[PDB]
Amino acid sequence: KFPRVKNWEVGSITYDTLSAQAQQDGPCTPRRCLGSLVFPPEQLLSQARDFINQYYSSIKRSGSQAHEQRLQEVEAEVAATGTYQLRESELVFGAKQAWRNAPRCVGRIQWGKLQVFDARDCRSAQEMFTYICNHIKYATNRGNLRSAITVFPQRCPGRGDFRIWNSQLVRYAGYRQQDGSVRGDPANVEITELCIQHGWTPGNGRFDVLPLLLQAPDEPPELFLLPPELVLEVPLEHPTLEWFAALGLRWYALPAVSNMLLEIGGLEFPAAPFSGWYMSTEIGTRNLCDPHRYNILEDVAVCMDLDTRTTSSLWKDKAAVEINVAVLHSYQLAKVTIVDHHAATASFMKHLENEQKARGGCPADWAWIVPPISGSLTPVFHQEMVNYFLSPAFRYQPDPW
Amino acid sequence: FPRVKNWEVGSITYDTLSAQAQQDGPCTPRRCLGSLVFPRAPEQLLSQARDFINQYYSSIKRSGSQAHEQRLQEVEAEVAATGTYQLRESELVFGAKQAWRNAPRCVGRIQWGKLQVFDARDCRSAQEMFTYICNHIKYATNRGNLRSAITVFPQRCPGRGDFRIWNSQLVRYAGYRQQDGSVRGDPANVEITELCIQHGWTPGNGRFDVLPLLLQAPDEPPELFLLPPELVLEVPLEHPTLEWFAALGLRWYALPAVSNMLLEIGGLEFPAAPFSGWYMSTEIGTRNLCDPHRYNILEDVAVCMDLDTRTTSSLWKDKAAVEINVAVLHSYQLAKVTIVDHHAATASFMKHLENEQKARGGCPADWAWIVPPISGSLTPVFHQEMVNYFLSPAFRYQPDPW
Ligand code: HEM
Ligand code: HEM
Ligand SMILES: Cc1cc(N)nc2cc(-c3ccc(CCN)cc3O)c(F)cc12
Ligand SMILES: Cc1cc(N)nc2cc(-c3ccc(CCN)cc3O)c(F)cc12
Ligand SMILES: C[C@H](O)[C@H](O)[C@H]1CNc2nc(N)[nH]c(=O)c2N1
Ligand SMILES: C[C@H](O)[C@H](O)[C@H]1CNc2nc(N)[nH]c(=O)c2N1
Ligand SMILES: [Ca+2]
Ligand SMILES: [Ca+2]
Ligand SMILES: [Cl-]
Ligand SMILES: [Cl-]
Ligand SMILES: [Gd]
Ligand SMILES: [Gd]
Ligand SMILES: [Zn+2]
The missing domain is CATH 3.90.440.10 (Nitric Oxide Synthase;Heme Domain;Chain A domain 2)
Known part of the structure; x- marks a missing residue:
């Protein structure tokens, strides 16, 4: 009942006991796996109570005095209002946990360091x-x-x-x-x-x-x-391809996602933009090289005088790597925080081990953790992962x- | 049925074939284990056999024919009399091809209809x-x-190893x-x-x-x-422009011929049925030579390439890995040994998915294994949602x- 999780590079084995705590149902069944899909009254009180218990156990003061006072508070609140109010420390813990629980986030080694801006x-x-x-x-x-999150007012009944x-x-x-x-x-x-x-x-x-x-x-x-x-913004240039600057490519410093919903103990914040810093493959591989994004890979390959007539010259790979080099160099040159995919995945491995000790496992979405270039050159490729939905959560x- | 989206083009299909999934995978609505490498008698044999026969007779467009009915009764009688049965030669050929066609981790299934089946039963x-x-x-x-070939040795049977x-x-x-x-x-x-x-x-x-x-x-x-x-x-490995590469003394063999899997057809089990195709170059260039737990040559090549291996942000690993993959493709093409690069292989797999959507309404595909180990999002399968499930006949x- 506790999934065995192996790392094939090192041979180490762990067991994800956290998966048992999974709040909500994912898309998979014993008949078929849909892990690769991008988009896979008193209810409020059960989730609210769940979260409060989480919170007080996480500060070691559960069972004890402020714990019950908080639970009866939320009970009375919801009876009075239909909803309830998070304490500012609960919002902070709830935002951090929701980041810490995000299976597709490779940057979660940073989860303890988040600036929460209360805009409620x-x-x-x-x-x-x-x-x-x-x-x-x-x-x-x-x-x-x-890293920062700004939390705007929660959804409430009757109000937009x-x-x-x-x-x-x-x-x-x-x-x-x-x-x-x-x-x-x-x-x-x-x-x-x-x-x-x-x-x-x-x-x-x-x-x-x-x-x-x-x-x-x-x-x-x-x-x-x-x-x-x-x-x-960071204008993009290459350390040695001096024509790369002239392509006029740029990207912005701040990855700040503003369309996801933050859920904390049954409360829903439909506006809660959060931001970190970029991993370089997000810009250099996905945003600039995806066929349905800027799709610049053939442009760069032409400028490198690569043979684009045959796949087997690996012109796509060589152009992609140099675009990622340009991104890394350009952000570093502009002293804008950026992390390359090797560093970030090495840190995620540390995060996995810390989370194994911290709470028996870590939800991770292999397809999203493995970088979109050089997959198997990074240690997460060889790491088996378990994906499940914990709350608080970004949705x-x-x-x- | 699961809706399945290609994010490069926006197209949407529904995998109705998954609804016929036989055996259970390792996932539950609680938790997905799709990234795990190894996730895992008369009347159940009969449902397996009849389903297989039904597949055989559909494949030749003679479903419900008297030959179809007669073969089902023939299998029924042999299972009742012997507890097992024997495939006809044509069923063995069809079943080996189907097991390849059903292999969710094989990106080379565009070729599934071209399989030489050696009957060593x-x-x-x-x-x-x-x-x-x-x-x-x-x-x-x-x-x-x-x-591409498979040799099928005698099936498992009671009272004999x-x-x-x-x-x-x-x-x-x-x-x-x-x-x-x-x-x-x-x-x-x-x-x-x-x-x-x-x-x-x-x-x-x-x-x-x-x-x-x-x-x-x-x-x-x-x-x-x-x-x-x-x-x-075998192929001695050299690089088209890095002449010192030849001095590493690297080689790989032409023929990827896996011999340790079990072929299952219609409930019969063939524990020895080695099968082979040809390599995708990233299997050799990226996994076999650059896996830290395999030949682990990445740093040595990057050092020789004069790359700054002291910081990861030079992307020396990606640069060295790409040239190693170049060497593999150049060396096989030079030796005139079939090889396919991950770009061609994945484009052909996209065609396979389209053929199979029309042919059977779906295709079992294990995204983590279908996306190549380098350059994943540069290939179209990265952007293809996929449904993984177990059909039979199967390699296990x-x-x-x-
Ligand atoms: C600190 C540096 C961070 C790095 C390097 C990082 C890296 C990444 C990457 C590469 C992805 C995949 C996104 C994509 O492929 O488009 C991702 C997703 C995600 N990140 Fe992080 N991130 C960071 C900070 C944060 C912060 C501060 C939060 C929340 C407070 C967060 C929550 C998430 C979530 C929820 C997702 C997945 C959203 C989804 O399901 O699509 N991350 N991150
Ligand atoms: C003809 C050219 C072929 C190509 C390019 C090809 C390609 C591949 C690749 C790249 C993999 C993943 C291997 C790994 O990561 O170690 C794979 C797996 C597989 N291939 Fe193919 N293949 C070919 C032919 C065949 C044939 C002829 C068969 C069977 C008759 C077959 C059955 C399989 C199976 C069963 C697996 C997955 C085994 C497992 O579950 O680990 N393939 N193939
Ligand atoms: C905090 C953070 C940091 C970062 N460095 N990158 C991030 C990327 C996404 C992200 C953006 C778009 C989509 C859907 C479109 N592909 C999914 C995402 O996870 C995200 F939410 C948050 C990110
Ligand atoms: C027919 C065929 C062709 C090919 N070009 N490659 C193939 C790779 C594997 C394969 C080999 C080893 C492992 C386990 C060790 N990683 C899993 C596999 O799927 C396989 F079975 C068959 C292959
Ligand atoms: C179909 C597939 O799920 C889709 O292309 C995924 C694959 N893995 C990903 N991984 C990350 N980090 N970001 C993504 O957008 C995606 N997209
Ligand atoms: C942990 C992970 O499942 C494992 O490393 C897998 C990932 N995807 C793979 N994909 C292919 N084609 N071959 C492999 O050996 C692997 N290894
Ligand atoms: Ca017009
Ligand atoms: Ca007989
Ligand atoms: Cl982005
Ligand atoms: Cl191999
Ligand atoms: Gd020029
Ligand atoms: Gd040279
Ligand atoms: Zn799954």
């Missing part, structure tokens, strides 16, 4: 924008990036919700044409029409930072331009529209 | 086994124009456990190398010494057979026979 007193899109801009400024920190319509705080525009192609980021094609629809006058470059479409409960979403000096959620 | 000694295997190797190697090939592949390099705890040759083959010596093989000391075969006939200890060196086609892992 937020009203209006204009205040959200101020919280968000403060977040961006704090997290960017002139390039020495610091705070939503950030943008998937991330920094998103480059994607424009179609009557030639069908996209200029800019094909991923953001949709939020770009939405920004234009809502009044944004579009740029026409490959790296036009989008406005933020912030939405207050029931209110239409309001367009907000981000101060250029707030949005730190995907429907789009607001 | 009348084999009776380890010596005849060896002769069948040499024929297999000769046929499949085909002096470097590789041909199994035929087994102890080696995990027909061609393996010796792995000599140094007393330091280190290994000279291939660390993956330390156990089988020790069994070879203990069974009378006089070892070598090189890093690419072809192992002898340990062949087990029913109720008989394994017998040692040396492969004729001219049967074992089985215990080591010692």
Whole structure:
């Protein structure tokens, strides 16, 4: 009943006893595995009680006095209001745990260090924008990036919700044409029409930072331009390919995801943007080389005078590696925090071992932990993993529209 | 049925075939174990046999025909009289092809219909086994124009031991456990190398010494057979532009011929049925040569390439691994030995998935094994959602026979 988990590079064995605690059901059954799929009243009180028990056991003071006082508080709250309020220390612990529980996050070795910005007193899109801009400024920190989450008001009955319509705080525009192609980021094609629809006058470059479409409960979403000096970008150059700079490639410093829902003890925060720093393959391999993203790999290969006529020259691989080199060099040159996939996966291995001792296991999504280049060159490739859903958790959620 | 999305193009399919999944995998709604390497009698044999016969008669578009009905009754009567049954020759060929077609971890299944099936079911000694295997190797190697083949030795049956090939592949390099705890040759083959010596093989000391075969006939200890060196086609490894690469003295063999899996067809089990195709270059270049627990040559190549191995952010590992994969492809193409790079192999697997969606409404595919070990998202299978499940006929892992 406790899955055996082996590391095939070292031969070491552990058992995931944490998987027993799995809150919610994943997509898999004994008949078929769907691990590779991207998107796989008194209920409130059972989850709330679960979380409080978690919390007090984690500070060692469960069973004891403040524990029961807190439980009867939440009981009375929900009886009075239909919902309840997290203590600020519970929100902090809940945000950290939700990060610590994220199976697809390779950066979780950092989970203890997270700046939680309590925006639960937020009203209006204009205040959200101020919280968000403060977040961006704090997290960017002139390039020495610091992990942060800003928690906007929870969903409540009868009332609408705070939503950030943008998937991330920094998103480059994607424009179609009557030639069908996209200029800019094909991923953001949709939020770009939405920004234009809502009044944004579009740029026409490959790296036009989008406005933020912030939405207050029931209110239409309001367009907000981000101060250029707030949005730190890194122009991309290569240490030895001097023509690489001239490709005009750039990316932004701050990976700040703003469309996921934070769930803590049955409470749901549909707006809680969090940010860390980038792993270099996210930019250099996925964002710039995905066929359905900037898809620049053949451009770079042409500039390297590679033989793109045959797959077997591995021109795709050589071009991809040099784009990742350019990303690493360019971020380092700009003194912007970045981590390469070897360092990050080596740290995740440490995280796995710490979590094995800390709580008997760690939910990890192998397909997402293994980097998108040089998979088996990293130690996570040889690490068996168990994927399960613990709470508190970050969850995907429907789009607001 | 599970909806399955390709994220490169946006296309959506539903895997209705998974609904027919026989045997259970290791996952539950509680927890996914899809990344685990080894996750794992009259009337159940009959449901397995009838389902197989039904598959055979569908494959030739004669379902519900009198030949179909008659064969089912024929199998029924033999199981009732004997507790087992015998495949017809045509069913064995079809069943071996189906087991390949059903292998979720095989990215090379575009080829599944082109399989030479050698019927060795009348084999009776380890010596005849060896002769069948040499024929297999000769046929499949085909002096470097590789041909997919399977030789099927006699099925398991009550009251008689199994035929087994102890080696995990027909061609393996010796792995000599140094007393330091280190290994000279291939660390993956330390156990089988020790069994070879203990069974009378006089070892070598090189890093690419072809192992002898340990062949087990029913109720008989394994017998040692040396492969004729001219049967074992090998490729010296050189790089197209890194001339010092040749000096590393690296080689690999032409023929990937796995010999330790169990073939299951219609509830019958064939514990010895070695099968072979041709290599995808990342198996040699990335896993076999660069796995830290295999030949582990990555640092040495990167040092020789003059890369800064003191910091990971130079991506020296990725650069050295790519050139090693280049060397493998260049060297096999030079030697005129079939090989496919991971880009061609994965593009062809995408075609396979499309063929199989039309043909059977789905395809069992193990994403972690289908995505190549380097450059994963540069290949289209990275962006393809996949459903992993177990169909029969099937190739299955089985215990080591010692
Ligand atoms: C500190 C440096 C961090 C690094 C290097 C890092 C790295 C990564 C990477 C590479 C991914 C895969 C994303 C993709 O492929 O698009 C990911 C996902 C994720 N990260 Fe981290 N991350 C960091 C910080 C954080 C923080 C601060 C949080 C939350 C407070 C967090 C929560 C998550 C979650 C929930 C996911 C998965 C979301 C999903 O299911 O799609 N991470 N991270
Ligand atoms: C013809 C060219 C072929 C290519 C390029 C190819 C490719 C591959 C690759 C790259 C793997 C993963 C191997 C590993 O990571 O160690 C694999 C696994 C596998 N292949 Fe193929 N293959 C071919 C032919 C065949 C044939 C002819 C058969 C059977 C008749 C077959 C059956 C299998 C099976 C059963 C597995 C998975 C075994 C396991 O569960 O570990 N393949 N193949
Ligand atoms: C905190 C954090 C840090 C980082 N360095 N990277 C991150 C990437 C994602 C992420 C972005 C988009 C998607 C869906 C589109 N592929 C899934 C994600 O996990 C994320 F949420 C959070 C990230
Ligand atoms: C027919 C075939 C062709 C090929 N080109 N490659 C193949 C690789 C494996 C294979 C080999 C070893 C292991 C376990 C050791 N990692 C698992 C496998 O799937 C296999 F069975 C069959 C293969
Ligand atoms: C189909 C497949 O699940 C999809 O391409 C996944 C694979 N692994 C991933 N891994 C990471 N880190 N990020 C991703 O977006 C994905 N996408
Ligand atoms: C732990 C993990 O499942 C293991 O390393 C797997 C991952 N994917 C693989 N994929 C292939 N094709 N071959 C392998 O040996 C492996 N190893
Ligand atoms: Ca037009
Ligand atoms: Ca008969
Ligand atoms: Cl990103
Ligand atoms: Cl191999
Ligand atoms: Gd030029
Ligand atoms: Gd040279
Ligand atoms: Zn699963």
